[PDB]
Each structure stands twice: as structure tokens, then as C-alpha cells.
Design a protein around this ligand. Structure first.
Ligand SMILES: C[C@@H]1O[C@H](OP(=O)(O)OP(=O)(O)OC[C@H]2O[C@@H](n3cnc4c(=O)[nH]c(N)nc43)[C@H](O)[C@@H]2O)[C@@H](O)[C@H](O)[C@@H]1O
Ligand SMILES: C[C@@H]1O[C@H](OP(=O)(O)OP(=O)(O)OC[C@H]2O[C@@H](n3cnc4c(=O)[nH]c(N)nc43)[C@H](O)[C@@H]2O)[C@@H](O)[C@H](O)[C@@H]1O
Lengths: 338, 343
């Protein structure tokens, strides 16, 4: 049930209006070894989008210009490490880091998992007159002119979300990956497949004859999505589980053993909850033949709730991200090795 | 006043005594290049000491041997622990666990055990001596071994000033013992202070005596202040240096960790971090050096901070805390380090 997840995301993107004040110039250098795809990706990331609400940003890649921040990936400016990969920061080289780890280093570290960036992209993709998902009026993401192509590209997704189709009347499970260097993910596929065909849409264990072009439309056509990170790490929760919620399919998840902190455990299969794969495949089999249990799970809020409100673990929000950077900009200390 | 610090350190070292003289085996892999000197030094560090109270330790320096823990900062797929003397944060991609100086919380994966704690362990050990001016509680862990009798012979002047048999005001101005040349801020500060009052240099850097002092503690006890600078700045990076000052009964003139006041009573030493520039702190050093009362106030302050009258180590660093950390490590089977696989 993606809608409540989008509602909380849209709320977490809420920030004070700045009428009286004007977005001050902020100059951000990107490290030299950063490719051009890396730069395109950063410029389109939720981080860049967030900062762009409070600063007039200039992004460059010139080591000779005095900048306010420098973003890298392993000068005398403040260096910020920002990874979308399962890599802990090196605090000897970087003053500040943005990652996945469940760690507290006061002002030096901020946990901002890639799932949050994926939510940003989804939110923008439903600012569309044809989308089955709704954004609160006058919220930041509804500010821009909407598109009108959503229903066209996702007929089956819209159909199911629009109650114009039965979720129980679809295939078993999808699996979309193109990185073959993930032994646990590959072994889990083989194991579940041999118990019920699992449909492959990416380079790996493919069974379509081509690689799907629209993952969300593709995932909308099955009851479950094999949702495995490519390696285990505590707090390492990427775009994958989001894609499953968004496509209205049950995530069968593996990756961060602490994933229940970030998402409501009644909303998905957490393979980490079992002692072995057989036991998890058992629960999946059960879900697939007991329509009410399958249904309950599909309609659960993806987010946990406390004090009568759905929430993002540790209150991840635009304000949290903006305060983290506001603290970096005002603090003169250089922590990296000189 | 070192006595109270030693008193707190001895209390922090109290744990129940091994119930049964059958400490379970613990195999630790350490640096392959280490010679017998380094192995002796490690068998004498506080971390080894604390663990030997609960395990029968065996060290391994053979790469083709299995171990329960793999140490230091040099195996790839073993239970790895990062431990370094340097001002270096841990690489958590390679190490499952780490022990360091950083003020960081990574739940079960990280423990802050500053080098100052190990220096205290060594001071306590040396004062298990019939001639020492510092006393260890009876039947306490450090008192249980056979004591030596050479302390006074080697630290006469130190004993004299601690044993109220000499005047602390009747000593030179300041000592400076450093041999690592690469330490810009420290080197620069010694010049600054030295031009407003000769600073006696006992190490290879800014040497004044014409020779390198063999007993640092005996030497520093002969001056009112000790120039106590770390070689680099780091939050929580407090080494053996400030401890040697307290031990030698001289006022530490300190720079290094800007949060050093969390670990130590700021009324007991000159925290250069607390000043806008060197000149302001030097002014304060001059003031204390010419206002007896102020000088003795500081020299007599408890080195440790107190809470409701009781002295404490920041975050309750203790033998119990260190053993609980290692018990969790040993009992946790989760591999946290990157799980290599070549493709
Ligand atoms: C984004 C990046 O993913 C990393 O996981 P990795 O195992 O290296 O790549 P993966 O194979 O899981 O694919 C990454 C995402 O792209 C989707 N995908 C894969 N193949 C296809 C395809 O043929 N057609 C479409 N439309 N989509 C595809 C896949 O489902 C994933 O969502 C991870 O290490 C890193 O942290 C990042 O998440
Ligand atoms: C132990 C190590 O010290 C590191 O500090 P560093 O600047 O690298 O070396 P330093 O020059 O400060 O010496 C370290 C300690 O040894 C003492 N010392 C130096 N020279 C002499 C000497 O000639 N005679 C004696 N008796 N003692 C000497 C000095 O006073 C220091 O206490 C630090 O980076 C690292 O983390 C460790 O603390």
C-alpha cells in the first residue's frame, strides 16, 4: 500500500517558507575522479533537491576555486562523503559523511539511506494527472506543472491500485537484477523458483527473453517481488524495497537485518526473521495460498507508527538534512587529516 | 595531585576475582613483524592485562593459524579488532570492531579507550613499589604482585616534592620532552612560550640539556609546568602525555583534544583550547607562574571531574566496561566486515 508511505514522505518534505529571506549562494565542489554520470546523479539526488530549497547552488569541479563544501568518494575545504553503496565512511579523509550506517558521531554523520532518495523520485513521478497516487495540494512536489503520461506507461499498476483489478489475479513473484555478483540473492532465487516459477526481468536469471524497461509496471504484475540488497549491512536499505511498495507488490526482503526499524514488519516478508531459507520460503508459500493474510500484508502501512503518526526511522526529513548542513556551514573546524 | 587520579584508576580496575583458576582460552592474532620486544610491551599493555583476568591468552603471529580475534591495524575473514596508538579513526568496512579515542557510538562495534588509560595502568604498576610516594589500596589487583624498591632511587626529586619534602614553587619554569619533529603547533608553541621564559627541552626537539632525558617523569617533576602537546589535533585524542604531567606533580600546559575537559578537570591544568590564541594562554601561564595561590590551587585540584563528590572517568571507562565489550565480541557471531568474494 504505497499511498500512506507517500503521505508520510510528502509530510517529511515539509519546510518553513522563506518569504523575507532569499536563498544565499552556496558553492559546492564535486571531487575530480567523480565521473559525469556520478555528477548527473548527484545533481538529481534528493540531497541536491533539498539543499536547493534553501541555497542558490553552484556546482563545479574545479579544485582552484574556493568552495563552501566538497563532495567525494574515496584541498583544505570541508569534505563530505556521500555514498549510495554499502560502504562505511572514512572519517580520516572526510570531515562529514552521509550514509546508511546505524552510527552516531554527533555532528559528523547523518544517516540518509538510498530509499529516501528513491521516494523523492517516485513523489515527482506522480505529480501527474494520470497517476494512481495522490500528492497533497500546495505541497512542494505539487508546485511544478504535472505530467500526463503516468497511466499510459503503467496501465496494470494503475489498474490494480485503482481497484480496477484483482491483486490476487497475477503471477507469483518478480525478480529484477542485473548484477550477478550477489551469491545470496542468486541462491535465494534458485531456491524459491524451484518451488514455484519466479519471473526474471533483468540480466540475471532472466526468463522473459529481454530486460524489462519499466520495472514498476513489471513489478505491478506479480503478487511478490524478490527484494534482495546485493550484500548485507546494518541500515543498508536501498531503492529496492521502495520499488516493491510502489508497484503494489509484497517485498520479499533481505539485506539490512535491522530493516524492521525503517519499515513496518507487517508490511513485508523479512527473510532475516528466519533461521534458514527453507523456513522463509515456507512463509512465502503460506502467504501465496492464504488470500486474507496476503491481503492484510499488502494493505499494511509500509511505515511504522508511534504516537498516532507514521514515521521515518530517526525522523529522517528535509529539516533534519537541512540542519545537518546548516551545522556544517557554520562550523569552522576541519577534522580531516592534514 | 596524582594520588586521587590513581585512587580512581584503581577503583575503575576492580572486578570480581576469577571464580575458578581455569580461564578459558582466547587466541589473539597480532602483528607478524613484531619482535620479542613488541610482544613483551603488548603483554604489558592494559588491554592484555584486563583480558588475562578472564581468559588464558595465547598470541599468534603465524598467518596460517586460526584465532578467535585478529588485532591492531595491519585474517581477512576472521573476527577483526581495530586498535591503534595513532590519531586515526577505524575503517569499519575491514574491521568488525574497534577500540579508539573517537567520541562515537556504533553500538556493540566500538569502544573508546584512550591511550591515557593504558598510561595509568603502567603508572599504577610502577608504584607497586615500597619506595613510591603514591599508594595503592591494599589487596587491590595492582598490589597483589611482588613490589619493587627502585622508584625513589630513580625519582628522588619527584618523591621529594610529593612527600612534602620540597617546595613545588622552588623549581624551574617549564619542561618540554618531545622527539618527533613533525608536530608544527607544538613546535611553534614552545618557541612562543620560550621567548617569554626559557623552556627546558629534554627530548630531541628543542633540546636544552645537551642530552635526551632518560627518566621523563623524574625530569618533569623539576619544573612547575610541563608543555603537554599532542602531535596532532583530534577530538578525544588524549594520550599518555597529560598523565605524565599529573604523575610528575607539574601543571600540564595542554593542547590536542578540544574536548579534553570531558576526560579531565579543567581546573587542574592549563587547557590551551580554552583561549582565542596562543598569546592569551601564555598570558594565563604567566599569571599562574607569578601568583602562588592560583598555581597551588590548580596543582592541588583532582585531575578528574567529579559528580556529587565522586571522581569519575568520562563515560565510566573501567575494567568492567572493557570486559563487557569483549564478552559481547566473543559471543556475537555476526560478521560485520566486508565479505570478500572475488568475481
Ligand atoms: C542502484 C544500486 O543497485 C545496487 O545493487 P546491484 O545488485 O549492484 O544492482 P542491481 O542488479 O540489484 O540493479 C540495481 C537496480 O536497478 C534495477 N534493475 C536491474 N536490472 C534491471 C532491468 O533490466 N530493467 C529495469 N527496469 N531495472 C533493472 C534493479 O531492480 C535494482 O532496483 C546497490 O549495490 C547500490 O547500493 C544501489 O542500490
Ligand atoms: C607514544 C606516542 O607518542 C606520540 O607523540 P609523538 O609526537 O609522535 O612522539 P613524542 O615526541 O611526543 O614522544 C612520545 C612520548 O615519549 C616521550 N619522549 C620523547 N622523547 C623522549 C626522550 O628523549 N626521553 C624520554 N624519557 N622520553 C621522551 C614524550 O614526552 C612523549 O610522552 C603520539 O602521537 C602517539 O599517539 C603516542 O602517544
Amino acid at each position: 500500500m504505497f499511498q500512506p508511505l507517500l503521505d508520510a514522505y510528502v509530510e517529511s518534505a515539509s519546510i518553513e517558507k522563506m518569504a523575507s529571506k532569499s536563498p544565499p549562494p552556496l558553492k559546492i565542489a564535486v571531487a575530480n575522479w567523480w565521473g559525469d554520470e556520478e555528477i548527473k546523479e548527484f545533481k538529481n539526488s534528493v540531497l541536491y533537491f533539498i539543499l536547493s530549497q534553501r541555497y542558490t547552488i553552484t556546482l563545479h569541479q574545479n579544485p582552484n576555486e574556493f568552495s563552501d563544501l566538497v563532495f567525494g568518494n574515496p584541498q583544505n575545504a570541508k569534505r563530505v562523503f556521500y555514498t549510495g553503496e554499502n560502504e562505511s565512511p572514512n572519517f580520516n579523509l572526510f570531515d562529514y559523511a552521509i550514509g546508511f550506517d546505524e552510527l552516531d558521531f554527533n555532528d559528523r554523520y547523518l544517516r540518509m539511506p538510498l530509499y529516501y532518495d528513491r521516494l523523492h523520485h517516485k513523489a515527482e513521478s506522480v505529480n501527474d494527472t494520470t497517476a494512481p497516487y495522490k500528492l497533497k495540494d500546495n505541497s512542494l512536489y505539487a508546485l511544478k506543472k504535472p505530467s500526463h503520461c503516468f497511466k499510459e506507461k503503467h496501465p496494470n499498476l494503475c489498474a490494480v491500485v485503482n481497484d480496477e483489478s484483482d491483486p490476487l489475479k497475477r503471477g507469483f513473484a518478480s525478480f529484477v537484477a542485473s548484477n550477478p555478483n550477489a551469491p545470496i540473492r542468486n541462491a535465494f532465487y534458485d531456491a524459491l523458483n524451484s518451488i514455484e516459477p519466479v519471473t526474471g526481468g533483468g540480466s540475471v536469471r532472466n526468463t522473459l527473453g529481454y530486460n524489462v524497461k519499466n520495472k514498476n509496471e513489471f513489478l505491478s504484475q506479480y503478487k511478490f517481488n524478490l527484494c534482495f540488497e546485493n550484500t548485507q549491512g546494518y541500515g543498508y536499505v536501498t531503492e529496492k524495497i521502495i520499488d516493491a511498495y510502489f508497484s503494489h507488490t509484497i517485498p520479499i526482503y533481505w539485506g539490512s537485518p535491522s530493516v524492521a526499524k525503517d519499515f513496518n514488519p507487517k508490511s513485508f516478508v523479512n527473510v532475516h526473521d528466519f533461521k534458514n531459507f527453507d523456513e522463509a520460503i515456507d512463509y512465502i508459500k503460506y502467504l501465496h495460498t492464504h488470500k486474507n493474510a496476503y491481503l492484510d500484508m499488502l494493505y499494511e502501512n509500509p511505515l511504522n507508527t508511534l504516537d498516532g503518526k507514521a514515521y521515518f526511522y530517526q525522523n529522517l526529513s528535509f529539516k533534519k538534512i537541512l540542519a545537518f548542513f546548516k551545522t556544517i556551514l557554520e562550523n569552522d573546524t576541519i577534522y580531516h587529516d592534514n
